[PDB]
Design a protein around this ligand. Structure first.
Ligand SMILES: Nc1ncnc2c1ncn2[C@@H]1O[C@H](COP(=O)(O)OP(=O)(O)OP(=O)(O)O)[C@@H](O)[C@H]1O
Ligand SMILES: COc1ccc2c(c1)CN(Cc1ccc(C(=O)O)cc1)CCS2
Length: 337
């Protein structure tokens, strides 16, 4: 609603609405439909196969309003308005079609040949978001009318399986309406308004939010199994690749504090390839999904070692010791975050 259509976009909008409805009234005929009084699916009949004047005025209103909303959404996402050339837009191309698959109306079959334009993937992704917004509008209309999602289609319960998120949406109807709207956008560019796609947002939020507030869960062995001396080994297999920390923790480790931030835990962050004790320092390489990290501690000379799929991880220098010297204290127990 906040979008104000400039006058050039307005008088282009009128005849692009005309162009789209006539595109539709031969796409139905090439699908094989035929003109008729009532909108019957089995009879293969619709009054809309004819010019907009004799076409039902309510369907004309729908077509014009959806074209206006399409252009308004394109402007609302920030698509740069494109002008090819005034005489290029004044020039109109006609490509004749066979009568059986040609519209009953007198409009030109192909104002623009779908071939001679190489459509840039930037505005192709723009057409993607346009389809997503259009289906959002449709679903909003259904909710306003009171329709709700139901796996089996039922009109009397107003239950529709189509009411689903766009990514989860049915592939067949998805590609159908989606290619209809891609060819509509293709036509509006080919007519002369070669709209320039806006910038692509490379930055991603990466979905760091979690259920509830807690960001990590710490798993550790019992405090009674603390080792005071000797050589010990355990393995940590990363089913997924991501934010994990594994190592040895003191029996006083706090569940709410991240491993290695404090002084009471020694951890290895393979996701950042970084060690953790009273802070973080670069250590080793990163793991992939399915990698196994071996944790080796020798409590006699107070050293810790780490392995990634067998090979011993090493510092920025050639040293293989993850941590050089630490007091035995009250022992260490295996831990993972
Ligand atoms: N060529 C077209 N391209 C896109 N949308 C169109 C086109 N022609 C018509 N429409 C829209 O499709 C709508 C179809 O409405 P229809 O009567 O089929 O469904 P409905 O009344 O919501 O029924 P129900 O959802 O219960 O099946 C029309 O009202 C119009 O807004
Ligand atoms: C996708 O454009 C079209 C193509 C063909 C037809 C219509 C719309 C109009 N229809 C009503 C209709 C419209 C849209 C939907 C929908 O997909 O939500 C369902 C029914 C009657 C049969 S002719």
């Amino acid at each position: 609603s906040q979008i104000v259509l400039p006058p050039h976009l307005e008088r282009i909008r009128e005849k692009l609405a005309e162009n789209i409805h006539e595109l539709w009234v031969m796409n139905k005929i090439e699908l094989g439909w035929q003109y008729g009084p009532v909108r019957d699916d089995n009879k293969r009949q619709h009054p809309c196969l004819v010019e907009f004047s004799k076409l039902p005025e309510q369907e004309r209103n729908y077509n014009l309003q959806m074209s206006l909303e399409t252009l308004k959404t394109l402007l609302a996402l920030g698509c740069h308005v494109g002008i090819s050339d005034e005489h290029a837009e004044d020039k109109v191309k006609k490509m004749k079609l066979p009568k059986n698959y040609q519209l009953t109306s007198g409009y030109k079959p192909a104002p623009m040949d779908l071939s001679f334009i190489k459509l840039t993937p930037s505005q192709e992704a723009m057409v993607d978001k346009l389809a997503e917004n259009a289906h959002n509008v449709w679903a909003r209309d259904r909710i306003r009318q009171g329709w709700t999602y139901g796996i089996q289609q039922d009109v009397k319960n107003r239950r529709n399986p189509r009411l689903v998120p766009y990514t989860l949406l049915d592939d067949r109807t998805k590609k159908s309406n989606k290619d209809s709207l891609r060819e509509a956008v293709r036509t509006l560019l080919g007519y002369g308004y070669n709209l320039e796609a806006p910038d692509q947002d490379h930055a991603a939020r990466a979905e760091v939010c979690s259920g509830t507030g807690e960001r990590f869960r710490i798993f550790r062995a019992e405090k009674t199994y603390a080792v005071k001396a000797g050589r010990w080994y355990f393995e940590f297999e990363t089913v997924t690749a991501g934010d994990m920390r594994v190592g040895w923790s003191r029996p006083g480790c706090q569940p709410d504090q991240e491993l290695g931030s404090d002084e009471r835990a020694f951890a290895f962050d393979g996701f950042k390839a970084q060690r953790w004790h009273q802070g973080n320092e670069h250590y080793g390489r990163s793991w992939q999904a399915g990698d196994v990290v071996g944790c080796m501690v020798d409590m006699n000379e107070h050293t810790m070692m780490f392995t990634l799929n067998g090979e011993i991880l090493l510092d920025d220098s050639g040293s293989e010791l993850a941590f050089k010297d630490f007091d035995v204290g009250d022992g260490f127990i295996p831990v993972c975050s």
